[PDB]
């Protein structure tokens, strides 16, 4: 098991570059049992676990899950695609979103 800090010291923030998080994930093999940790200041960002469509269009309403208090720690316990976005402001629209593929432990 591996523990990942989404974004690095950049943490979970509004990116200057729209592909930042695509870049951060790349080269990482997320497996079942691994844990993602999103760090941010209270109210400045958040985490909503969404479907692929909601991910693509940045739909904030009807999350699978939604978390607001800062480290949001999520364990990956199923194989397959997982999508996360920040619903605060225009953050998702400018790239604060994460797409990963979880494989076996
Ligand atoms: Cu945000």
Short mmCIF file of N, CA and C and ligand atoms in Angstrom, two decimals:
data_model
loop_
_atom_site.label_atom_id
_atom_site.label_comp_id
_atom_site.label_asym_id
_atom_site.label_seq_id
_atom_site.Cartn_x
_atom_site.Cartn_y
_atom_site.Cartn_z
N UNK A 1 0.84 -1.24 0.00
CA UNK A 1 0.00 0.00 0.00
C UNK A 1 0.85 1.26 0.00
N UNK A 2 0.19 1.98 -0.86
CA UNK A 2 0.90 3.23 -1.05
C UNK A 2 0.01 4.42 -0.68
N UNK A 3 0.64 5.46 -0.14
CA UNK A 3 -0.07 6.66 0.24
C UNK A 3 0.37 7.78 -0.70
N UNK A 4 -0.58 8.36 -1.44
CA UNK A 4 -0.27 9.44 -2.38
C UNK A 4 -0.82 10.80 -1.98
N UNK A 5 -0.01 11.83 -2.12
CA UNK A 5 -0.38 13.19 -1.86
C UNK A 5 -0.72 13.79 -3.22
N UNK A 6 -2.01 13.91 -3.51
CA UNK A 6 -2.46 14.45 -4.79
C UNK A 6 -1.87 15.83 -5.02
N UNK A 7 -1.22 15.99 -6.17
CA UNK A 7 -0.61 17.26 -6.50
C UNK A 7 0.79 17.45 -5.92
N UNK A 8 1.36 16.65 -5.01
CA UNK A 8 2.74 17.07 -4.54
C UNK A 8 2.81 18.27 -3.54
N UNK A 9 3.81 19.12 -3.60
CA UNK A 9 3.68 20.22 -2.71
C UNK A 9 2.66 21.10 -3.37
N UNK A 10 2.36 20.86 -4.62
CA UNK A 10 1.35 21.73 -5.15
C UNK A 10 0.02 21.45 -4.45
N UNK A 11 -0.12 20.23 -3.90
CA UNK A 11 -1.34 19.83 -3.21
C UNK A 11 -2.55 19.91 -4.15
N UNK A 12 -3.75 19.99 -3.59
CA UNK A 12 -4.97 20.05 -4.38
C UNK A 12 -5.33 21.53 -4.52
N UNK A 13 -4.98 22.13 -5.65
CA UNK A 13 -5.25 23.56 -5.85
C UNK A 13 -5.78 23.87 -7.24
N UNK A 14 -6.17 25.13 -7.44
CA UNK A 14 -6.53 25.64 -8.77
C UNK A 14 -5.23 25.75 -9.61
N UNK A 15 -5.05 24.86 -10.60
CA UNK A 15 -3.87 24.84 -11.47
C UNK A 15 -3.77 25.96 -12.50
N UNK A 16 -2.53 26.38 -12.74
CA UNK A 16 -2.22 27.42 -13.71
C UNK A 16 -2.25 26.76 -15.08
N UNK A 17 -1.81 25.51 -15.10
CA UNK A 17 -1.74 24.69 -16.31
C UNK A 17 -2.90 23.70 -16.19
N UNK A 18 -3.78 23.63 -17.21
CA UNK A 18 -4.93 22.72 -17.20
C UNK A 18 -4.58 21.23 -17.15
N UNK A 19 -3.36 20.87 -17.53
CA UNK A 19 -3.00 19.45 -17.51
C UNK A 19 -2.19 19.02 -16.29
N UNK A 20 -1.99 19.94 -15.35
CA UNK A 20 -1.21 19.62 -14.15
C UNK A 20 -1.51 18.25 -13.53
N UNK A 21 -2.77 18.00 -13.19
CA UNK A 21 -3.12 16.74 -12.55
C UNK A 21 -3.03 15.52 -13.46
N UNK A 22 -3.14 15.73 -14.76
CA UNK A 22 -3.01 14.62 -15.68
C UNK A 22 -1.56 14.21 -15.54
N UNK A 23 -0.70 15.23 -15.53
CA UNK A 23 0.74 15.07 -15.41
C UNK A 23 1.14 14.41 -14.09
N UNK A 24 0.55 14.86 -12.99
CA UNK A 24 0.88 14.30 -11.69
C UNK A 24 0.52 12.82 -11.57
N UNK A 25 -0.39 12.30 -12.39
CA UNK A 25 -0.89 10.92 -12.09
C UNK A 25 -0.10 9.84 -12.75
N UNK A 26 0.26 10.25 -13.95
CA UNK A 26 1.08 9.62 -14.95
C UNK A 26 2.36 9.02 -14.44
N UNK A 27 2.51 7.70 -14.53
CA UNK A 27 3.72 7.10 -14.00
C UNK A 27 3.45 6.52 -12.63
N UNK A 28 2.19 6.61 -12.25
CA UNK A 28 1.77 6.09 -10.96
C UNK A 28 0.79 4.96 -11.16
N UNK A 29 1.04 3.86 -10.47
CA UNK A 29 0.17 2.71 -10.54
C UNK A 29 -0.62 2.69 -9.24
N UNK A 30 -1.88 3.10 -9.30
CA UNK A 30 -2.72 3.09 -8.11
C UNK A 30 -3.31 1.68 -7.99
N UNK A 31 -3.13 1.05 -6.83
CA UNK A 31 -3.64 -0.31 -6.62
C UNK A 31 -4.69 -0.35 -5.52
N UNK A 32 -5.42 -1.46 -5.43
CA UNK A 32 -6.42 -1.57 -4.39
C UNK A 32 -5.69 -1.52 -3.05
N UNK A 33 -6.25 -0.77 -2.10
CA UNK A 33 -5.62 -0.63 -0.80
C UNK A 33 -4.83 0.66 -0.66
N UNK A 34 -4.56 1.32 -1.78
CA UNK A 34 -3.82 2.58 -1.76
C UNK A 34 -4.72 3.72 -1.27
N UNK A 35 -4.11 4.78 -0.77
CA UNK A 35 -4.87 5.92 -0.26
C UNK A 35 -4.46 7.26 -0.87
N UNK A 36 -5.45 8.02 -1.33
CA UNK A 36 -5.21 9.34 -1.90
C UNK A 36 -5.48 10.38 -0.82
N UNK A 37 -4.62 11.38 -0.72
CA UNK A 37 -4.84 12.44 0.25
C UNK A 37 -4.83 13.79 -0.47
N UNK A 38 -5.95 14.50 -0.38
CA UNK A 38 -6.09 15.83 -0.99
C UNK A 38 -5.94 16.87 0.11
N UNK A 39 -4.96 17.76 -0.02
CA UNK A 39 -4.71 18.81 0.97
C UNK A 39 -5.12 20.17 0.40
N UNK A 40 -5.78 20.97 1.22
CA UNK A 40 -6.25 22.29 0.81
C UNK A 40 -6.76 23.05 2.04
N UNK A 41 -7.00 24.35 1.90
CA UNK A 41 -7.50 25.15 3.02
C UNK A 41 -9.02 25.07 3.06
N UNK A 42 -9.58 25.03 4.27
CA UNK A 42 -11.03 24.93 4.44
C UNK A 42 -11.81 25.96 3.63
N UNK A 43 -12.77 25.47 2.86
CA UNK A 43 -13.62 26.33 2.04
C UNK A 43 -13.04 26.83 0.73
N UNK A 44 -11.73 26.69 0.56
CA UNK A 44 -11.06 27.15 -0.65
C UNK A 44 -11.14 26.14 -1.78
N UNK A 45 -11.33 24.88 -1.41
CA UNK A 45 -11.44 23.79 -2.38
C UNK A 45 -12.25 22.67 -1.72
N UNK A 46 -12.50 21.61 -2.47
CA UNK A 46 -13.22 20.46 -1.93
C UNK A 46 -13.02 19.29 -2.86
N UNK A 47 -13.61 18.15 -2.51
CA UNK A 47 -13.51 16.95 -3.33
C UNK A 47 -14.90 16.34 -3.52
N UNK A 48 -15.21 16.02 -4.76
CA UNK A 48 -16.47 15.39 -5.10
C UNK A 48 -16.05 14.22 -5.97
N UNK A 49 -16.51 13.01 -5.63
CA UNK A 49 -16.18 11.83 -6.41
C UNK A 49 -17.32 11.74 -7.39
N UNK A 50 -17.01 11.78 -8.68
CA UNK A 50 -18.07 11.84 -9.71
C UNK A 50 -18.01 10.79 -10.83
N UNK A 51 -19.00 10.73 -11.70
CA UNK A 51 -18.87 9.77 -12.78
C UNK A 51 -17.99 10.35 -13.86
N UNK A 52 -17.80 9.56 -14.90
CA UNK A 52 -17.00 10.04 -15.98
C UNK A 52 -17.65 11.22 -16.69
N UNK A 53 -18.96 11.17 -16.86
CA UNK A 53 -19.66 12.25 -17.54
C UNK A 53 -19.59 13.53 -16.72
N UNK A 54 -19.82 13.41 -15.41
CA UNK A 54 -19.78 14.56 -14.52
C UNK A 54 -18.37 15.13 -14.50
N UNK A 55 -17.39 14.24 -14.66
CA UNK A 55 -15.98 14.60 -14.68
C UNK A 55 -15.73 15.45 -15.92
N UNK A 56 -16.10 14.89 -17.07
CA UNK A 56 -15.91 15.56 -18.35
C UNK A 56 -16.59 16.92 -18.43
N UNK A 57 -17.78 17.04 -17.87
CA UNK A 57 -18.50 18.30 -17.95
C UNK A 57 -18.46 19.13 -16.68
N UNK A 58 -17.65 18.68 -15.72
CA UNK A 58 -17.54 19.38 -14.45
C UNK A 58 -18.95 19.55 -13.75
N UNK A 59 -19.75 18.48 -13.66
CA UNK A 59 -21.03 18.59 -13.00
C UNK A 59 -20.77 18.42 -11.51
N UNK A 60 -21.19 19.44 -10.77
CA UNK A 60 -20.99 19.45 -9.34
C UNK A 60 -22.21 18.92 -8.66
N UNK A 61 -23.37 19.02 -9.27
CA UNK A 61 -24.50 18.49 -8.55
C UNK A 61 -24.52 16.93 -8.55
N UNK A 62 -25.09 16.30 -7.52
CA UNK A 62 -25.21 14.80 -7.35
C UNK A 62 -23.90 14.02 -7.32
N UNK A 63 -23.02 14.43 -6.43
CA UNK A 63 -21.78 13.65 -6.32
C UNK A 63 -21.99 12.17 -5.91
N UNK A 64 -21.02 11.29 -6.24
CA UNK A 64 -21.05 9.95 -5.67
C UNK A 64 -20.73 10.18 -4.18
N UNK A 65 -19.74 11.05 -3.95
CA UNK A 65 -19.30 11.45 -2.62
C UNK A 65 -18.86 12.90 -2.73
N UNK A 66 -18.96 13.62 -1.63
CA UNK A 66 -18.51 14.99 -1.59
C UNK A 66 -17.91 15.22 -0.18
N UNK A 67 -16.72 15.82 -0.14
CA UNK A 67 -15.99 16.11 1.10
C UNK A 67 -15.43 17.53 1.09
N UNK A 68 -15.62 18.16 2.24
CA UNK A 68 -15.28 19.55 2.42
C UNK A 68 -14.25 19.86 3.46
N UNK A 69 -13.98 18.96 4.39
CA UNK A 69 -12.98 19.35 5.34
C UNK A 69 -11.65 18.80 4.96
N UNK A 70 -10.66 19.70 4.99
CA UNK A 70 -9.31 19.49 4.67
C UNK A 70 -8.56 18.63 5.58
N UNK A 71 -7.57 17.19 5.16
CA UNK A 71 -6.98 16.19 4.18
C UNK A 71 -8.36 15.43 4.03
N UNK A 72 -8.52 15.38 2.83
CA UNK A 72 -9.51 14.41 2.48
C UNK A 72 -8.72 13.15 2.10
N UNK A 73 -8.95 12.05 2.82
CA UNK A 73 -8.24 10.81 2.56
C UNK A 73 -9.21 9.78 2.01
N UNK A 74 -8.94 9.30 0.81
CA UNK A 74 -9.84 8.28 0.24
C UNK A 74 -9.05 7.01 -0.08
N UNK A 75 -9.55 5.86 0.35
CA UNK A 75 -8.86 4.61 0.05
C UNK A 75 -9.44 4.08 -1.26
N UNK A 76 -8.59 3.45 -2.07
CA UNK A 76 -9.04 2.90 -3.33
C UNK A 76 -9.29 1.43 -3.09
N UNK A 77 -10.54 1.00 -3.13
CA UNK A 77 -10.73 -0.38 -2.75
C UNK A 77 -11.42 -1.18 -3.81
N UNK A 78 -11.53 -0.54 -4.96
CA UNK A 78 -12.05 -1.25 -6.13
C UNK A 78 -11.23 -0.91 -7.33
N UNK A 79 -11.04 -1.91 -8.17
CA UNK A 79 -10.28 -1.75 -9.40
C UNK A 79 -11.15 -0.94 -10.37
N UNK A 80 -10.52 -0.27 -11.33
CA UNK A 80 -11.29 0.51 -12.29
C UNK A 80 -11.10 2.02 -12.27
N UNK A 81 -11.76 2.73 -13.20
CA UNK A 81 -11.64 4.20 -13.27
C UNK A 81 -12.32 4.93 -12.11
N UNK A 82 -11.65 5.96 -11.60
CA UNK A 82 -12.16 6.80 -10.51
C UNK A 82 -11.96 8.24 -10.97
N UNK A 83 -12.95 9.10 -10.75
CA UNK A 83 -12.88 10.51 -11.15
C UNK A 83 -13.14 11.46 -10.00
N UNK A 84 -12.30 12.49 -9.87
CA UNK A 84 -12.46 13.47 -8.80
C UNK A 84 -12.37 14.89 -9.35
N UNK A 85 -13.16 15.79 -8.79
CA UNK A 85 -13.13 17.19 -9.21
C UNK A 85 -13.27 18.11 -8.00
N UNK A 86 -12.93 19.38 -8.18
CA UNK A 86 -13.11 20.35 -7.11
C UNK A 86 -14.35 21.09 -7.60
N UNK A 87 -15.35 21.28 -6.75
CA UNK A 87 -16.56 21.97 -7.19
C UNK A 87 -16.56 23.46 -6.90
N UNK A 88 -15.53 23.94 -6.21
CA UNK A 88 -15.45 25.35 -5.87
C UNK A 88 -15.17 26.21 -7.10
N UNK A 89 -16.00 27.23 -7.30
CA UNK A 89 -15.80 28.14 -8.42
C UNK A 89 -15.59 27.55 -9.81
N UNK A 90 -14.58 28.05 -10.51
CA UNK A 90 -14.27 27.59 -11.87
C UNK A 90 -13.13 26.59 -11.84
N UNK A 91 -12.71 26.17 -10.65
CA UNK A 91 -11.56 25.28 -10.52
C UNK A 91 -11.57 24.03 -11.42
N UNK A 92 -12.70 23.35 -11.51
CA UNK A 92 -12.78 22.15 -12.34
C UNK A 92 -12.58 22.54 -13.81
N UNK A 93 -13.26 23.59 -14.24
CA UNK A 93 -13.20 24.06 -15.60
C UNK A 93 -11.78 24.39 -16.03
N UNK A 94 -10.94 24.82 -15.10
CA UNK A 94 -9.56 25.14 -15.45
C UNK A 94 -8.57 24.02 -15.12
N UNK A 95 -9.08 22.83 -14.83
CA UNK A 95 -8.18 21.72 -14.57
C UNK A 95 -8.05 21.06 -13.21
N UNK A 96 -8.70 21.56 -12.17
CA UNK A 96 -8.58 20.90 -10.87
C UNK A 96 -9.55 19.72 -10.90
N UNK A 97 -9.04 18.59 -11.37
CA UNK A 97 -9.82 17.37 -11.50
C UNK A 97 -8.79 16.26 -11.66
N UNK A 98 -9.13 15.06 -11.23
CA UNK A 98 -8.19 13.96 -11.33
C UNK A 98 -8.87 12.72 -11.84
N UNK A 99 -8.21 12.05 -12.78
CA UNK A 99 -8.71 10.83 -13.40
C UNK A 99 -7.67 9.72 -13.26
N UNK A 100 -8.03 8.62 -12.60
CA UNK A 100 -7.08 7.53 -12.44
C UNK A 100 -7.69 6.18 -12.74
N UNK A 101 -6.83 5.18 -12.90
CA UNK A 101 -7.29 3.83 -13.15
C UNK A 101 -6.65 2.94 -12.10
N UNK A 102 -7.49 2.33 -11.27
CA UNK A 102 -7.03 1.47 -10.20
C UNK A 102 -6.95 0.01 -10.64
N UNK A 103 -5.82 -0.64 -10.37
CA UNK A 103 -5.65 -2.04 -10.72
C UNK A 103 -5.48 -2.88 -9.46
N UNK A 104 -5.28 -4.19 -9.62
CA UNK A 104 -5.13 -5.07 -8.47
C UNK A 104 -4.01 -4.78 -7.49
N UNK A 105 -4.14 -5.29 -6.26
CA UNK A 105 -3.14 -5.08 -5.21
C UNK A 105 -1.87 -5.91 -5.40
CU1 LIG B 1 -10.66 24.14 -5.90
#
